[PDB]
Symmetry: D3
């Protein structure tokens, strides 16, 4: 544009949902509170996420390219591009072309390869959607698959108990498809849950382990990856980012779980947003 960004700008390719804490209504306040301008490229408008029984849904596939055409005319420079849940191969094509046209030598490209969970694909989707997400992540610097997504992206049978050595192998194989940094979430431990990561730079493998509370809050993945993104953009090391994001989520769940509560509403993000202002007093990351 006219001048270099005074606040770094992050193109956020997620939906807008009216209720719940998912997608743009978590990405925007988190990354803005971490110092960054979030510029939404919305994929859809929903009354609420699809974990409620009903929802309104308006597909924005056709508007995406029109927004992008305008951003080109404005000559906006993005310091990062963060993609989340994409509805189709066509959206992957748009997003893929968007990254191609707007990337710069210093861009951070973060893709959450939203495909499935608990070993099954999300019901919307099939193996072609897996194939196209696999093509998209070749362009990414950082990806954040869950364990289900890891195996689908690798085209491997889902396995729920892998050794650390096997997980290291998996991380490395997925990193060979493009991404310098691969982060796997929701990896079981042996009460307890785990995040693993590999960085092609230095060939390092990291893990963070933390308590697991028996509650599912939709939007947890988008929250995680928003904190990873903002921590990395702030210049934090990979394992510090794992730690900040896992602790932040844990804090939010602790702030939420003690209430009689409808979990579909999400983590009570607003009660813990400003925790990110405090320095981490106890890290737990491990080099493996």
């Amino acid at each position: 544009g006219m001048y270099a960004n005074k606040v770094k700008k992050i193109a956020a390719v997620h939906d807008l949902s009216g209720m719940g804490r998912v997608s743009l209504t978590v990405v925007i306040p988190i990354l803005s509170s971490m110092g960054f301008q979030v510029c939404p490229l919305p994929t859809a408008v929903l009354s609420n996420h699809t974990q409620y029984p009903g929802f309104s849904f308006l597909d924005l596939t056709d508007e995406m390219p029109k927004i992008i055409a305008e951003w080109k005319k404005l000559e906006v420079q993005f310091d990062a591009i963060y993609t989340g849940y994409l509805g189709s191969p066509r959206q992957i094509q748009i997003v893929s072309d968007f990254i191609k046209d707007f990337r710069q030598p210093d861009s951070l490209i973060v893709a959450d390869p939203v495909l499935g969970d608990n070993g099954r694909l999300y019901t919307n989707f099939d193996m072609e959607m897996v194939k196209e997400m696999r093509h998209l992540i070749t362009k990414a610097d950082v990806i954040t698959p869950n364990l289900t997504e890891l195996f689908y992206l690798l085209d491997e049978p889902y396995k729920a108990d892998s050794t650390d050595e096997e997980l290291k192998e998996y991380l490395r194989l997925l990193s060979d498809k493009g991404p310098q940094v691969v982060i796997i979430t929701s990896v079981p431990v042996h009460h307890k849950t785990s995040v693993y990561a590999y960085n092609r730079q230095g060939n390092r493998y990291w893990k963070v382990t933390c308590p697991y509370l028996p509650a599912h809050y939709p939007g947890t993945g988008d929250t995680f990856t928003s904190v990873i993104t903002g921590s990395l953009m702030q210049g934090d090391s990979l394992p510090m980012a794992l730690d900040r994001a896992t602790q932040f989520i844990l804090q939010g769940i602790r702030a939420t779980f003690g209430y009689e509560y409808d979990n579909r509403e999400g983590i009570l993000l607003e009660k813990v947003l400003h925790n990110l202002d405090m320095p981490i007093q106890m890290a737990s990351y491990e080099l493996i």
Copy 2:
């Protein structure tokens, strides 16, 4: 819904714009950083605000009622409803019916009666749009007209120099149309700018005066009224809210004005969001 809100919920009826800091991309991070869940009811999707030469525009008039129908099914309770720029009498009808159906005895209804500036109506609009905004504000507890909007809502010739006594009269006449609290922004002083307010409760009139820097940043009104809203929701007195919001804007402009900068991008909100965490050390409000 199933339980009382643990984080107060605010229905935000504004557009989603990809670039600039306006509408939902300021309302969401501000009110979320102040402790409140923002539940967007988007009016339109834009690549960028209309102060740039071009913009994409997708009217969401037809989706609004579908989202609302779903919110009814979810039985969501809103602690506040905040409306901003509305595109048409039809949107006012939707919003008006929405307030009617979702209001509760403790709801705060805040309407920014976005109609014009510098004495002219925004070019989209005409006197019928003024007539319907006038019908809408009858349902509001707090409105935040600029000086242009004051005069149109009262159906009075624009006057750029009024006495304080005349402004008090104007405030009182507009409050008689419904709103307990009327806040007028961008009121010239005698280098310096002013906000005035009237509260039917106690029949009090307040003003805050602060420096004026020669720069227009689109989104300033939405920023102001987001801070007013969140301050009031936090339990602040009316004049404290005037002070917090005016100082917050002043801080943001000071953080922005010293750079070679394209003003259309907005105030550098992210550099000052956390100022709201600090207590005000110097108030300047006046009882008039």
Copy 3:
């Protein structure tokens, strides 16, 4: 009174002691630092707590009703009423009548049923005092007995090792006498100490376990229950309140134990009061 409380008001029925950190000289600064006005209804004036060899003592039993008669004339509304150590059945009668006359639909009534410790009644007291505290707690929403008090209130032989299942039973039986929330302090573990809680709402049982340092600081119970009270009044979940209060006490003891120190002076509260301003970075509560 004339208007709704802008700062919530808490009637504090405790003694005033000149030295030590007990009763009103801990309740007042804690709850005031948490955002609440403490309105003392003093039960007695003492030079110092009774764990020193001597003390002055002035019984205020006869002044209590006179203060209350004036509060009625002022039409003060209390958002909470917190009772601590009461000297006699007559004080219980006064306090009981006070709660009856001043309670409102939203009042929080917190009673610390101060009766004994280490399995014996405090030496002042007998089984009639136990019977009248049992009548008083029927009116309370939250009680905080120690393990000795639990058993006396239930009219059960003291047992120092109970299973978690037995403690759950005890919690439930005591809750049946009135209190929605029963919190048991100083419950041995298996080096380590424990707090347990039951909430009739949702039928939930919680526990927090933390290190035990070998030192008794008089006023620890009043400190605990002041933090529980203020955390609950702030809108925290029950288990968060258990966590904040147990960590706060642990912090204070850690700040005190490393000095050559006369323990009767209490925890060095002033060195840790502002810890309560920070968000909890590590919770430890457990659902049982």
Copy 4:
């Protein structure tokens, strides 16, 4: 006692009032929040201050010496002694003997010579009470008379407009009666109010001027002098103490004045207590 104080201890000779923010219910939370243990020597127990139409009142004159006798047995060392409103010459005698017996080479003795306001003595009192307060302040290091009290202590006709030069003279004459530091509050300016001070050490005269809001909140003097005391105990210079205390009061009044409010309840202290944690960003003191 057994060891040197790890938290400095301040004997506070003020009443305990159940409602309002005056005397011990402001002194205790303020000085405790500033890092200091407040050890109350209560002069009376009241349902509420005497600016309401009625109040209960229990004179503690006879208990004061009993408390002190116990404090002697405990060998408590006080780092400061702060006296406020005293009911009679007999209380002055007790307090005077208390200071004599408990003072140490480093003690700070602060006396607020509570006698009158708006040029008249408080109605309880007469010239003998003035004579005995004059004897008491000979033992003090810091006194905080209002302008009415200045003139009575000097045995001079009240004058409401004095020059700065005349006020300097007055300060110096009163300092000659004992006190190293004399602080005069509520000194009119020329909308605006003023505090003046003299320090015999360096022979310096200081003033702070700040806005005046038209509202009387009982307890303002006790609040002021509690902040002066704690600031001085923290090692602040005299003029910094004037600044912290005047700004703190101004902040509290600003937090209170915008509400429909019964002023007799006091400044909303709890909304601003933690302002004292922040460093002063703008001083206004003047050397005169």
Copy 5:
């Protein structure tokens, strides 16, 4: 070196003085507290600054090149180079060669052209030292002359009252000798003091005006320019940097001036270092 700096590194060319707060003992703690590693290249070792009657002095001219030769071998990359008081033309030669060898495309070079004050050269120095400082500043991006230094660097008769228009001219002429940013300190106003600045980028002129207290604290210039440097390195606009640095100094002087104090010891920096952690609540910069 082996990797890019994780904490930006600033070569600081100043003396080390044992007592006083000047040179490296202010530069190091300030810039370190602002987020930056200070790598000292000491010019001399002194017991104390030369405003005391005596001082030890050890010239390090001969060691400077040896340190630099080692830094070359380590391949250290400096993000900024900040020079202060230089003792001779020979030191200017060393420093000048150092900047030449270690500058990179993004280096910030800050030179305080320490030459004189109150219209006279420092007594050590003559016009040849002025000529060589003039050669040095051609290599600088930011310089911070006082008004005396401005005139000497321009080779112009000292004038103590100049118009703003004349000062703008002076700023522009000095900027033509090399420096993009010229900051003049200690510019009289009309009780009050002023800082002016010019930025060749955008051709902007700024000023900040603040109170003047009658006290000279040696080290004030080094403190100022350390804050300017760190604020600019943090990405602040020029006028924000003027504001942060002037307010920081004002805060320190306010924290110091109220004590009986030996001014030669400097501003009580440690009492205000952490003020820099707080966001500026009131700016005062002016575009001229």
Copy 6:
């Protein structure tokens, strides 16, 4: 000097190194950020510490007495004296005479008896240097030997596995040579590392255990002992000081270890300096 210190002054006898974070470039910013003026008495000037392959080195042995002679003339009073790495018996003589001449009844004398590591003496040194450090520590209140230094100071064969009981014995024997407080660092545990301490006052033994990351950062000892010093000067108990300093180091290492990094540059101190502003939320000290 003319007046008592308003900021406590600490004479720091360490070298000045241009690169790395060791000696004065860590001591100065740490203790200054903790509230204390650091007055350097430099022992040498180096381009960088001696763990790099080459370094410049300028011995300041001959300047030390000249600086001290000037400090005597200034009549500076030091509240603490902290010695680190000393190059020779001659420097020990200077430092020893300095402590003798400048000590006051309240001085804290802290000596880090820098002699060796991993069981060998630093290669510069021999048993005479051990003998003279042993003479120096007789004058110290607090010493911080590593395990290697413990054994040399006691003139005992190095043992890498000692029982806690044996370590207590060692602590006590070394304390008998003078120091009230002996702190041993880098004591192996049984992944994990340990600090032990003895205080002759109360005859107490303390230990803190924390994670061990496999990386050596030169300057870790100087960082530790700077935090111990400042924590003690702030009035913290011995075990709190052990905790603050060990956690601070752990935080810094965690902030550093996740990067590809040249360890010789030191812990990224600037990323964690302000952690010291936060209160410790989890202590781990143990009384043994």
